[PDB]
């Protein structure tokens, strides 16, 4: 039994890739997201990613195929170097602390804008030690929570 919140989460994830809202993720759009995160896949490499889950053979990724992609490639858990890779995405200035301002920017860059109230809520929930920023240990620890 899927909840509507689960469905909403899948939709948001899908829409991050599907920037033109046409219902399919193309190599261009997959590429755009991975380039926003510092990666440089080739067009062929992006096509290969699509091919793996491209069950109807049309060359692009639709909603159910994207679910399959996440099932396979969100296969459990952030190891260590990948958690650390993610931290680096958010800690833009490399100083070891994610500021509210940093988080807001990175999130806008990905393509999900949220009220500064929301961003501050994210910082505040994760900020265990009280300094108003999120260090690596706190970034790691927020990932365990409900």
């Amino acid at each position: 039994q899927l909840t509507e919140e689960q469905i909403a989460e899948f939709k948001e994830a899908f829409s991050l890739f599907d920037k033109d809202g046409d219902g399919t993720i193309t190599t261009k759009e997959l590429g755009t997201v991975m380039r926003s995160l510092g990666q440089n896949p080739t067009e062929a490499e992006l096509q290969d990613m699509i091919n793996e889950v491209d069950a109807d053979g049309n060359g692009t990724i639709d909603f159910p195929e994207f679910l399959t992609m996440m099932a396979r490639k969100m296969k459990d858990t952030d190891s260590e170097e990948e958690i650390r890779e993610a931290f680096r995405v958010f800690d833009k200035d490399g100083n070891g602390y994610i500021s509210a301002a940093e988080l807001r920017h990175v999130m806008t860059n990905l393509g999900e804008k949220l009220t500064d109230e929301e961003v501050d809520e994210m910082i505040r929930e994760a900020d265990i030690d009280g300094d108003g920023q999120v260090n690596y240990e706190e970034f790691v620890q927020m990932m365990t929570a409900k």
Partner: peptide, 19 residues
């Protein structure tokens, strides 16, 4: 929602895609 935990997972997704 836990939007931030969700976005970290998506970032990890792209790491795992770019082999």
């Amino acid at each position: 929602r836990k939007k931030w935990k969700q976005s970290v997972r998506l970032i990890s997704l792209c790491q795992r895609l770019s082999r």
